[PDB]
């Protein structure tokens, strides 16, 4: 994700992708909520 306004930062070799996947996994919950609607 944007660690700060989509700033640059390769971080590491591929562990960066691993972390991204985790972010994604968790996010899904909030994502569904948004799809439904905040006031829904």
UniProtKB/Swiss-Prot annotation:
Outcome following mutation: residue 13 to R: Only 23% zinc-induced amyloid-beta protein 28 aggregation
Source species, domain of life: Eukaryota
Residue numbers marked as site, Susceptible to oxidation: 35
Reported effect, residue 23 to N: In CAA-APP; Iowa type
Site, as annotated: Implicated in free radical propagation: 33
Locations listed in the record: Cell surface
Binding site for Cu(2+) 2: 6, 10, 13-14
Glycosylated residue positions: 10
Marked site positions, Cleavage: 1-2, 7-8, 16-17, 19-20
Chain spans, region Interaction with PSEN1: 24-40
Binding-site positions, Zn(2+) 2: 6, 10, 13-14
Subunit structure: Interacts with S100A9.
Protein name, UniProt field: Amyloid-beta protein 40
Species this chain originates from: Homo sapiens (Human)
Source lineage: Eukaryota, Metazoa, Chordata, Craniata, Vertebrata
Gene encoding the protein: APP
Entire protein: shown range: 672 to 711 of 770
């Amino acid at each position: 994700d944007a660690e700060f306004r989509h700033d640059s930062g390769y971080e590491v070799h591929h562990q960066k992708l691993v972390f991204f996947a985790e972010d994604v996994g968790s996010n899904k919950g909030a994502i569904i909520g948004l799809m439904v609607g905040g006031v829904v």
